């Protein structure tokens, strides 16, 4: 299929290809920048508790104001490019909520570690 | 030798043949492993089986070991004239040398 | 992987004999070098083995007072193969010591089966006569 | 032992030392290069689901064409240096198969949780 | 509380705030250096099997030679700054023991899985 060949496919179809895109003085600056972008996303996954996973479920409920579409209307009727545009203004809210949910989980894990 | 083997075994071409190896429990087979060799007279031998289960490289699937405390066994499936030779069993451990048995002859009929 | 032994030799009783075992196609130091005797009146007998790496040797009780083993320093050919030779000396030969002598090398670099004589040389005859 | 002290040891014996090697203007270029080198392999582990592990079992079956060697022939009779040469032509093929298997696993675990 | 706000607090109190503190030409050197420090710490956590966690229990027993203090003397009576000075000469030894324990653990997990 190749890199980003899934971009025009439905979100459900695209989900099978995630590993394809997971891969990959001006020259020196470019090399540092490429590293920063890689790590930027990895830090977010670590913050969310999703590190090491391609697909990570969270405890944050879907908020219907972000989108009123049904799962079939999202997963089989849209591309990821279209989906990002539909919720482009809410992505920061979602990221913050995921972090807050992880913070509560870590507090609970701490108690469990002392108990057993 | 402390180990003993039957003087001979036989069977028809394509028949399975089994060769026993036995001795005192201290030699065969409590806490011991038995290896098997083909050893034609006047020629160097070839290792067939080690650790009573593993085939040496270059050894056909027709050869396989079996084990009991009283005796180790070698079984030859699909007997061929090519296998009509003398066989020996060897008791061994990781901390000791080989103890050879008396050997056996294999005859191929028809 | 191949082993090559010294050719057959005739000795008088009480004489010493030295038998070489040249090796090639594999790393000499990686595997144990075994020596095995075959005599018609005794069947196969273990003569013990010598490590080419540590120099450690294990002679069977029958041969501890009569057999000496030593090895040459290996000379590399490739990064994964080398050449070298093992030697064995037998003191005070008897008529009972006649028959074919074999050189053989260990099966594995590790595990419980590491020293088993997987590869054998053609073997050569020793003869004793008055 | 020491760094790479196990390199001449058998593949099985070498496994006890994995942590020894897991750790560890021109000066700036050296520093950036060391980072890129490190991240290259960590990126693969993250994709494979093997992140945080020194030894990681997968669901990919061994194809005998890659090697017909028995486990004793590999683990007790080889160095890792020799092994890498034997499968040097198949290494990238194996890597892709691991990635495909992980993505299917991530999808299947998601579906299990959707049902439950 | 904010970044490093727990520094004067006891170690036990500080352990609550770890979530907060886990976060957060010359510019090029600054960017490279920031990356090296992030990865240095993550490399150790990955080797230890502690990746993705703020608090990670190990199988390494405490040596009374490292400290003869009771848990109460440590957790309720010390700052982390004081504690680091007490074990400054033993920290590298402890790290190596953690790494060896992780490698033995994964080897045992592998051998267990071979039975399935
Ligand atoms: C560089 O390359 C070389 C070559 O590849 C590598 O060397 C090879 O390394 C492997 C792994 O260590 C060795 O395999 C091991 O061999 C031993 C048997 O050898 C023993 O018997 C010798 C007998 O000789 C005399 O001494 C005995 C004493 O009782 C007398 O009875 C005899 O009459 C003789 O006088 C003895 O000399 C040996 O001791 C000496 O040599 C050893 C060599 O390794 C030294 O350590 C000793 O200090 C001493 O100098 C030795 O006793 C087998 O026993 C091993 O099998 C056990 O260990 C395996 C480890 O993987 C394991 O898998 C097996 O299951 C088995 O473990 C069992 O036994 C253990 C005993 O403690 C138990 O704890 C365990 O639970 C289990 O029950 C193993 O087969 C190769 O022989 C060696 N090859 C050569 C040619 O030397 C070298 O390692 C490489 N270097 C590096 C850095 O990689
Ligand atoms: C900087 O350093 C200082 C000094 O180390 C440190 O202050 C110590 O903080 C610890 C807690 O971290 C205190 O230990 C606990 O004290 C609990 C309360 O007992 C008394 O103090 C109460 C107020 O304490 C808080 O607020 C003050 C400021 O007001 C602040 O200094 C304290 O640190 C703390 O934040 C007070 O409300 C309480 O009220 C009693 O007395 C009044 C008198 O009028 C009376 O009216 C009330 O009815 C009541 O009788 C009392 O005065 C105590 O409960 C606690 O023990 C419980 O919690 C622990 C922890 O969960 C459990 O393990 C335990 O089983 C109990 O459930 C514990 O003893 C310590 O006393 C402070 N030391 C001093 C000298 O004040 C600061 O926190 C440090 N700052 C930072 C940011 O780290
Ligand atoms: C670019 O865009 C086009 C148009 O969107 C995409 O083409 C679509 O591709 C998808 C995925 O392959 C197709 O989805 C499947 O279509 C099948 C069509 O039926 C076939 O068989 C009937 C006769 O039985 C024929 O008449 C018909 O023409 C087809 O030959 C459905 O049968 C499939 O349903 C099955 O699978 C789905 C998904 O798992 C299940 O939900 C169903 O229950 C069932 O099991 C499925 O619907 C889609 O039809 C294609 N559209 C068109 C118009 O052909 C391209 O894929 C896209 N390219 C890329 C790279 O993304
Ligand atoms: C142990 O290995 C040797 C040699 O195999 C090669 O060298 C090893 C160290 C390792 O690098 C392997 O991947 C290499 O292939 C085996 O000896 C070979 O046996 C075959 C079959 O008889 C023979 O054709 C070869 O010539 C031998 N050696 C060489 C260098 O060709 C030996 O059998 C292995 N022992 C086992 C599996 O028990
Ligand atoms: C859902 O999002 C809207 C818009 O941000 C917000 O006003 C509302 O409170 C959210 N609902 C919940 C339950 O968080
Ligand atoms: C699916 O989304 C597209 C693009 O917004 C839209 O045109 C189409 O009508 C949608 N289908 C349904 C059934 O809503
Ligand atoms: C095994 O490997 C060979 C060589 O790459 C390949 O041709 C063959 O298809 C592979 N078998 C399977 C089942 O993948
Ligand atoms: C404690 O440390 C000393 C000094 O390094 C060491 O000798 C001893 O073995 C250690 N104890 C344990 C249980 O590791």
Written account of the structure:
This is part of a larger assembly, with three copies of chain A (116 residues), one copy of chain B (110 residues) and one copy of chain C (130 residues). Chain A contains six helices and no strands. Chain A has helices at 11-14, 18-22, 26-48, 71-75, 80-86, 91-115. The N and C termini of chain A lie far apart (48 Å). In chain B, strands 1, 3, 4, 5, 8, 9 and 10 form a seven-stranded mixed sheet that branches. The chains are: A mainly alpha (116), B mainly beta (110), C mainly beta (130). Chains in contact: A-D, A-E, B-C, B-D, C-D, D-E. At the B-C interface, strand 4 and strand 9 of B face strand 5 and strand 11 of C. One 2-acetamido-2-deoxy-beta-D-glucopyranose binds next to loops of chain A.
Key words describing this protein structure:
part of a larger assembly; 5 chains; A: 116 residues; mainly alpha; globular; C: 130 residues; mainly beta; Immunoglobulin-like; 7-stranded mixed beta sheet; binds a molecule of 8 linked components (NAG-NAG-BMA-MAN-MAN-MAN-MAN-MAN); binds a molecule of 7 linked components (NAG-NAG-BMA-MAN-MAN-MAN-MAN); binds a molecule of 5 linked components (NAG-NAG-BMA-MAN-MAN); binds a molecule of 3 linked components (NAG-NAG-FUC)
Total count of domains of chain C: 1
CA-based shape of chain A: globular
List the total number of helices of chain A.
Answer: 6
Question: From N to C, what is the helix and strand string of chain C?
Answer: EEEEEEEEEEEE
CATH topology descriptor of chain C: Immunoglobulin-like
Alpha-beta content class of chain A: mainly alpha
Oligomer: part of a larger assembly
> What percentage of the residues of chain A does DSSP assign to strands (E)?
under 5%
Major sheet attributes of chain A = none
Gap between N and C termini of chain A, in Å?
A: 48 Å
Class from helix and strand fractions of chain C: mainly beta
DSSP strand content of chain C: over 45%
By DSSP, the count of extended strands of chain C is: 12
Instruction: Give the overall silhouette of chain C.
Output: globular
Secondary-structure element pattern of chain A, one letter each: HHHHHH
CATH architecture of chain C: Sandwich
CATH superfamily of chain C: Immunoglobulins
Organism (chains A, D, E): Human immunodeficiency virus type 1 (HIV-1)
Subcellular location (chains A, D, E): Virion membrane; Host cell membrane; Host endosome membrane
Membrane topology (chains A, D, E): Single-pass type I membrane protein
Protein name (chains A, D, E): Transmembrane protein gp41
